[PDB]
Design a binder for this molecule. Structure first.
Ligand SMILES: CC(=O)SCCNC(=O)CCNC(=O)[C@H](O)C(C)(C)COP(=O)(O)OP(=O)(O)OC[C@H]1O[C@@H](n2cnc3c(N)ncnc32)[C@H](O)[C@@H]1OP(=O)(O)O
Ligand SMILES: CC(C)(COP(=O)(O)OP(=O)(O)OC[C@H]1O[C@@H](n2cnc3c(N)ncnc32)[C@H](O)[C@@H]1OP(=O)(O)O)[C@@H](O)C(=O)NCCC(=O)NCCS
Length: 283
């Protein structure tokens, strides 16, 4: 019923809009299993008008936002209340966002999509699958037994920049500045895995009060398949539990779901899974 429809276009979300968006997020999560990446901490800050809110009678039923991370693409999050899907809401929101993307002269759009939900018809429309991002959690208080490999583990320091940059150069090709900034945030640590005296991998740890989060996990391609990734992740799990945390979270990017079996074996369960699909503007 169009009388009650309205689209609000904003530079940031006030506290009520954030509450509304979190309610919408929750109802999509229950229907879909996973949700797009919304970067709530970015929406809360004033930016210089990339959030588009669809209300029906003042109830938030649709949301789209644009995120200028890349220098030659833009990330797009779109969510529509399950009650109101297939009525053109997502298409209305994308149309509102396009002028702003064109004006910035970006031409490539990258959408984060709940795992498995849309693959059939994203393919039809010409989207290209890029990779997936999985957020997992291990809520077991028991440490991981075994998984011992001939590795030593070191906490990285500002002196390990060559080692860290070398690892990233092979896995995931200004890394000096990024590792310096990470190593200067007291919530972060990086564990380096050594085989004899050659660095062969690393994992980042972000510490919070009740949990810690593993990310940016790398094992050199030529050293994979020897148990080293499992040994490093087990080392990290046990380090986190020995500080008294009750949860280990994990953020991993993969092009293939089978790479996830390692983490399932170590007791992780998926809490959120997104697939990233790109498309050029003129479509
Ligand atoms: C292009 C994107 O928006 S990727 C968004 C990924 N986000 C999510 O998946 C979050 C959970 N899912 C949702 O919120 C919704 O299902 C969305 C955002 C994917 C689509 O929202 P809707 O308002 O229902 O989409 P809308 O009704 O505007 O349809 C837009 C187009 O996509 C098509 N479409 C939408 N959903 C589907 C679907 N499940 N299956 C097949 N086609 C679909 C429509 O046929 C339409 O095509 P058309 O322009 O040729 O007529
Ligand atoms: C960490 C990662 C790279 C794998 O590293 P790895 O050293 O090859 O991992 P492992 O050798 O420990 O494990 C490989 C397999 O052997 C199993 N394994 C490890 N130790 C084992 C042990 N004692 N007993 C039985 N199985 C074991 C693992 O469960 C794993 O499962 P799979 O065969 O079903 O796939 C991968 O899991 C990943 O996360 N990829 C996405 C992130 C990424 O690609 N970063 C860039 C790397 S270049």
């Amino acid at each position: 019923v169009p009388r009650g429809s309205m689209i609000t276009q904003v530079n940031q979300l006030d506290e009520l809009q954030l509450k509304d968006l979190k309610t919408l997020r929750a109802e999509c999560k229950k229907n879909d299993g996973s949700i797009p990446n919304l970067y709530i901490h970015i929406l809360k800050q004033h930016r210089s008008p990339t959030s588009f809110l669809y209300y029906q009678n003042g109830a938030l039923i649709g949301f789209l936002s644009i995120y200028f991370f890349y220098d030659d693409a833009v990330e797009v999050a779109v969510l529509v209340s399950p009650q109101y899907r297939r009525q053109g809401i997502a298409k209305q929101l994308i149309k509102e966002a396009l002028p702003l993307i064109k004006s910035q002269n970006y031409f490539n759009l990258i959408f984060s999509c709940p795992s498995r939900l849309n693959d059939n018809w994203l393919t039809s429309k010409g989207f290209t699958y890029l990779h997936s991002e999985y957020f997992m959690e291990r809520d077991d208080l028991n440490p991981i037994l075994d998984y011992i490999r001939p590795l030593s583990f070191r906490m990285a320091t500002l002196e390990d920049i060559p080692i860290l940059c070398g690892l990233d150069e092979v896995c995931f090709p200004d890394s000096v500045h990024r590792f310096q900034q990470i190593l200067n945030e007291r919530e972060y640590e990086i564990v380096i895995a050594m085989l004899n005296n050659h660095p062969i991998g690393k994992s980042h740890i972000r510490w919070q009060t009740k949990r810690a989060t593993l990310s940016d996990i790398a094992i050199l391609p030529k050293e994979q398949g020897k148990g080293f990734g499992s040994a490093l992740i087990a080392h990290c799990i046990n380090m986190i539990l020995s500080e008294g945390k009750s949860r280990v979270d994990l953020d991993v990017e993969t092009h293939n779901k089978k790479a996830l079996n390692l983490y399932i074996q170590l007791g992780f369960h998926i809490q959120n899974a997104c697939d990233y699909w790109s498309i050029n503007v003129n479509q």
